[PDB]
Amino acid sequence: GTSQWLRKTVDSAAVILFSKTTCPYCKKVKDVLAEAKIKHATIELDQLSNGSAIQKCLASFSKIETVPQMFVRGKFIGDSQTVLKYYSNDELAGIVNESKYDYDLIVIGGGSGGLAAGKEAAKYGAKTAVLDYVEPTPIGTTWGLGGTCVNVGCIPKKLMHQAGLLSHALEDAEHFGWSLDRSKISHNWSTMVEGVQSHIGSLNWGYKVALRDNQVTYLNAKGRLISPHEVQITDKNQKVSTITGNKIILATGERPKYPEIPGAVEYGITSDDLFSLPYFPGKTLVIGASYVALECAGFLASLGGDVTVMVRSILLRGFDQQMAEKVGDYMENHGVKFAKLCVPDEIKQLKVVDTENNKPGLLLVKGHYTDGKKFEEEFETVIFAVGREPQLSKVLCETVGVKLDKNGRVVCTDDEQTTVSNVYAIGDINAGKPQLTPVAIQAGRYLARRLFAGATELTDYSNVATTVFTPLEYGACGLSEEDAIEKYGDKDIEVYHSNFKPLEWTVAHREDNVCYMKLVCRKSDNMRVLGLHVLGPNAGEITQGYAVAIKMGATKADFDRTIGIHPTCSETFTTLHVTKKSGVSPIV
Amino acid sequence: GTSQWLRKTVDSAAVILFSKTTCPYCKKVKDVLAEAKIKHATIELDQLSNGSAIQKCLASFSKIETVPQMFVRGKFIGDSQTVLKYYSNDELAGIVNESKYDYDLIVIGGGSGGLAAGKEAAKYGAKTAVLDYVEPTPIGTTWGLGGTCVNVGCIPKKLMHQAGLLSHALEDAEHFGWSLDRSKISHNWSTMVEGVQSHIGSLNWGYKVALRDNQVTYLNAKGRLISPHEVQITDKNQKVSTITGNKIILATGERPKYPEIPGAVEYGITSDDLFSLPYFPGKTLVIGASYVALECAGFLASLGGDVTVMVRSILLRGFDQQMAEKVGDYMENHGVKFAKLCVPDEIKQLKVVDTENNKPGLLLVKGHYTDGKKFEEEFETVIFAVGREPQLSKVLCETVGVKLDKNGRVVCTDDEQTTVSNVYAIGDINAGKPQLTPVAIQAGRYLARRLFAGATELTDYSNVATTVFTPLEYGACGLSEEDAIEKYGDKDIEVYHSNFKPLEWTVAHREDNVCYMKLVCRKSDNMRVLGLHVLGPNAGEITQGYAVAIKMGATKADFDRTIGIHPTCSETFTTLHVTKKSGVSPIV
Numbered sequence A, B: 001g002t003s004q005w006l007r008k009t010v011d012s013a014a015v016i017l018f019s020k021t022t023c024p025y026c027k028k029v030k031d032v033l034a035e036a037k038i039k040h041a042t043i044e045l046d047q048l049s050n051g052s053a054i055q056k057c058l059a060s061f062s063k064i065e066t067v068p069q070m071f072v073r074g075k076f077i078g079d080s081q082t083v084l085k086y087y088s089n090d091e092l093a094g095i096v097n098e099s100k101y102d103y104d105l106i107v108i109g110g111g112s113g114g115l116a117a118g119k120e121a122a123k124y125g126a127k128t129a130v131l132d133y134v135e136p137t138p139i140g141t142t143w144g145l146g147g148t149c150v151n152v153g154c155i156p157k158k159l160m161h162q163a164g165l166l167s168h169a170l171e172d173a174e175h176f177g178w179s180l181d182r183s184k185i186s187h188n189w190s191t192m193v194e195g196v197q198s199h200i201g202s203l204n205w206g207y208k209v210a211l212r213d214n215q216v217t218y219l220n221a222k223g224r225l226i227s228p229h230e231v232q233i234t235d236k237n238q239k240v241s242t243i244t245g246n247k248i249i250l251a252t253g254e255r256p257k258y259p260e261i262p263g264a265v266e267y268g269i270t271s272d273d274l275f276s277l278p279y280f281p282g283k284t285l286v287i288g289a290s291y292v293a294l295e296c297a298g299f300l301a302s303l304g305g306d307v308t309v310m311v312r313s314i315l316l317r318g319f320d321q322q323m324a325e326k327v328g329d330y331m332e333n334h335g336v337k338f339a340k341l342c343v344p345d346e347i348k349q350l351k352v353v354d355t356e357n358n359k360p361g362l363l364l365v366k367g368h369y370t371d372g373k374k375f376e377e378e379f380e381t382v383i384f385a386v387g388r389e390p391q392l393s394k395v396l397c398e399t400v401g402v403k404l405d406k407n408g409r410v411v412c413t414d415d416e417q418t419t420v421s422n423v424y425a426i427g428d429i430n431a432g433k434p435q436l437t438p439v440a441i442q443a444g445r446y447l448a449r450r451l452f453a454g455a456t457e458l459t460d461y462s463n464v465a466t467t468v469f470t471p472l473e474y475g476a477c478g479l480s481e482e483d484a485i486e487k488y489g490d491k492d493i494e495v496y497h498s499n500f501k502p503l504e505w506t507v508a509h510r511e512d513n514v515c516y517m518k519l520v521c522r523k524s525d526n527m528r529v530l531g532l533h534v535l536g537p538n539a540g541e542i543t544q545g546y547a548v549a550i551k552m553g554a555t556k557a558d559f560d561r562t563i564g565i566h567p568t569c570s571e572t573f574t575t576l577h578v579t580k581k582s583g584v585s586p587i588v
């Protein structure tokens, strides 16, 4: 038990010192390693519950039972007198650098998960390389280090959402006494994009500086795993070579899907292209109904665009469907048009994109509704948001033996291990896990600590909160109402709900009964909160704190006994009382 | 035991029915009471864990042990056959309205707590009167029903705060691509005040309508308790009379203090006057350093005023002083001037307020610093925010026997009972309680339920979260750092902290390292979170949800295992790791 932990910790740590906080001989060894700039993990046996047993068990490796004991890649190096000997004789540097492989860790993929994993491992003395390459889009778009979120995801999407929110702030300012005239103000797309791209560039740079300062080797090259320990790399000059590593972390993420119809790849774009587009999209069709489709259609409409969303079946498949419909009704009331139960058949080119004068082209989109009627309309831009997929055939040779599921994602144990013992996977390509940046960062940092510092904590993937940044934001944590009922039966489920109006909306003359919130609870388990849902401004700020309480097992009684902060939107969660079964109206 | 709960419930309830959910005779009585428009409390005995025991003790009042049983004001009325006898003989209405007093409940004070208590009591058949009178300010300001929060507190203050925040929204919108020129835009005070006062008017009216629809008698008259059950009321016509009630709730609140110096009452104003002031204050001096003083100085500066705050000793006494200093440094950098370690001696009038042309007057303020030097400067408006106090001599006859503390607040047990067994106190006049609107409302609602519906739940006054709506907002829940160190010792306290920058501030070129958060934790109790603090935008929305987790005993490990929502300010709480003891910098 203890002994199986110790063997696993010793075998995979790069450099590790066993010690106690008081021990002055340990302090002498720590001082030598600091002076020679040798990074290492440290385990202070006196701070651990079973430190006595661990100490006895070290002798199975070193034949000694005292501290300090220093190990390098599974080999006992010595006590303090022996380490000082190697230092004094100029032998320590070569001992700590001796390895069967080029690297202790190779990370394939330089995004949210891979960067976090690599930097954390480097802190404990693991010799680390991170590989990142960005395959250009069909029209040639490419970007720098940091992955999907940084370059073509959460960061530019929320900045453009903020640009759209400011249009309503300009409107609201008149009612609060400011002299501006909202009608004579317009928006400049390219000025926005320049500011967004300047911030993204500061993040690209900041990650390169962070890897340099952690002594991580950064290769801007494409990686391919050809055997358990061998990674083939291809250069920007197409030079091919092979590097070896003890542990491998696959963190290569996903890219957007295109439907298989004429004209889609040639004349449409995806979110990969949208966030650096040199011209305003103009009259735009968004095909799809994911959070990506709706977030992009939302800010384009707030920025003055003529926008249509073409919806195959429902909005936000997989989210609470009452909330999804409230999200769509708000967008439709504020300018977004919807072509419901409709699918595209072909895109035709009427005008080529005008790169010189910085203007879009023109397209004809033909499609059909599910009853067979025809759709035909002209747009300047067509954005496909119909899902994302990994392409692990470009990353992972089939003979390595890494098992994939029917969607092409990696099948992992609860500690991220693949079917190949030294190979792990994190982030969007880990099958069945929520596909979010904070999850990938947590999994990558926690994994690096288990590999190289003897940690045991696992990543907890349950009840992870989300926020959809539509024009009215939607935050959630836990089960949808229909999933709770499916799992426990309608008679065991109580739903408390209420409309509400932000105080900021009163003087602004905004809508009375559009914002909404509900708690979905289990009667037979002391009214446990199974899911929390809120539609309103700053919904992500509102939701985050409640995710700690749900993690801890909060009940309806816990919300009732906590006092609200006034005046806020979030305080409405502390006084809920109208149930859905009562039939009483939730309006204010 | 169970029996002394039953006695108190029966003696105090106005009209109460003991029932079971599966009982068709109970349903016949319920339907008769509903048709007769008779409101009542209901105790469904089959949903209480010891409903069997309660059934037995009912016989001690009624000599029967079956269900249903009706009681009115402590007297057993009858089973199903007897109640239906009274109904068809036209005797029921006379029986349910028989009482020793004019009212089951008299509430003195129509504010946050009083209105909540009165409406909740009326839902259980208690015959309720609510008295409210607003004594005018020295310059004659008055307002309508709803209390300090509604008319001259949280509601107008947060709306003028929002008006000030929108100025930075105007500035930010240029960097996000909008074509306005912030430098050519001005603010109109009187347009703001009209919008703010129109919302307050809709609240005044809403409360009058709510009372009518709950059958609550509203008297706009000044009340005075002269004996345990007798309340003397004075008319708008100065007509005096007496009414009697069984239970009394004191809920009369506080009003601003003035310093005892020449000119203060005559020529200064307070927050009571500010929110309906017909003219812009102009160059303004705010005297004091409480949350009221700083919130007012803050939005006046954001609206373009020339604003000075005179501080006697420190900012935000009783709040975490590291956070108070960060709050004040932000306002000093954004244009509020501070006269530190200073106190006023007299206000001299130079120019009378011009009611005609809607202009302030002009004043000369004389004061001195603690080192002896002198202060002398002219201002158009002087606002005093040097605390608030009750005036219970105006409310309570000394002979009634209600004990007050040395500050003039009412001394209560943990169920709000005074030293006079039928008189209770709630809200700001209850000694030692946090003086907050949601606290008053919960105290009032919970008390009404104990008096008239047999409830037992008490109000929990511990760890109530707060937010100060300064230009950069400050949210808190639990102990300050210095209070935790004093209570437990420096060696048992660990503080995790970090600066942060909102994503929205990047493209707007706002400051890198002014927003800040920390967790104050107890080492020897599994790193329990004792206090949470955050300085940043939307701080009330950020803080609220964590108050539920802190109520449930959150530890640092609970915050670490919960995953963040990205991109948000609040997510920075889920990955804190820099300790104060380590000396590592908290900057980004």
Ligand SMILES: Cc1cc2nc3c(=O)[nH]c(=O)nc-3n(C[C@H](O)[C@H](O)[C@H](O)COP(=O)(O)OP(=O)(O)OC[C@H]3O[C@@H](n4cnc5c(N)ncnc54)[C@H](O)[C@@H]3O)c2cc1C
Residues within 6 Å of the ligand: A108, A109, A110, A111, A112, A113, A114, A131, A132, A133, A134, A135, A146, A147, A148, A149, A150, A152, A153, A154, A155, A157, A221, A222, A223, A224, A251, A252, A253, A254, A271, A292, A394, A395, A426, A427, A428, A429, A435, A436, A437, A438, A440, B565, B566, B567
């Ligand atoms: C439009 C959009 C908006 C989003 N908004 C949010 C949001 O608000 N909040 C949120 O939590 N999540 C959001 N997400 C999800 C978030 O972007 C992902 O969950 C996260 O970025 C995935 O991290 P990752 O490390 O798994 O992969 P990635 O971040 O995609 O990084 C993988 C990297 O590896 C590179 N790579 C691939 N193959 C190779 C190879 N063979 N060799 C070398 N390098 C390779 C890729 O080019 C890429 O740079 C959004 C996603 C999108 C598309």
Ligand SMILES: Cc1cc2nc3c(=O)[nH]c(=O)nc-3n(C[C@H](O)[C@H](O)[C@H](O)COP(=O)(O)OP(=O)(O)OC[C@H]3O[C@@H](n4cnc5c(N)ncnc54)[C@H](O)[C@@H]3O)c2cc1C
Residues within 6 Å of the ligand: A565, A566, A567, B108, B109, B110, B111, B112, B113, B114, B131, B132, B133, B134, B135, B146, B147, B148, B149, B150, B152, B153, B154, B155, B157, B221, B222, B223, B224, B251, B252, B253, B254, B271, B292, B394, B395, B426, B427, B428, B429, B435, B436, B437, B438, B440
């Ligand atoms: C400037 C300011 C800002 C504030 N901001 C906030 C905030 O953001 N959040 C928050 O939670 N709290 C805030 N507060 C505090 C909040 O307003 C109070 O805690 C709350 O109003 C207390 O309610 P109450 O029922 O005890 O008294 P009140 O709301 O003051 O109501 C008592 C009422 O009784 C009346 N009355 C008095 N004597 C008599 C009598 N003899 N007969 C009849 N009627 C009488 C009074 O005139 C008044 O109408 C703020 C306070 C101020 C001054």
Ligand SMILES: c1cc(CNCc2ccc3c(c2)OCO3)ccn1
Residues within 6 Å of the ligand: A133, A220, A221, A222, A234, A235, A236, A237, A238
């Ligand atoms: C598909 C794609 C490739 C090209 N990837 C290597 C590469 C090419 C260009 C680069 C780069 C890396 O860094 C900067 O520019 C090879 C084989 N199959």
Ligand SMILES: c1cc(CNCc2ccc3c(c2)OCO3)ccn1
Residues within 6 Å of the ligand: A001, A002, A005, A043, A453, A454, A455, A456
């Ligand atoms: C698995 C492992 C064990 C031994 N304790 C592990 C441990 C816990 C916390 C740690 C650590 C190591 O290094 C840094 O923090 C016993 C049974 N099963």
Ligand SMILES: c1cc(CNCc2ccc3c(c2)OCO3)ccn1
Residues within 6 Å of the ligand: B133, B220, B221, B222, B234, B235, B236, B237, B238
């Ligand atoms: C006209 C004006 C008002 C405003 N307050 C009147 C008033 C004046 C003095 C009072 C009072 C009430 O109770 C005790 O003394 C209400 C209704 N009608």
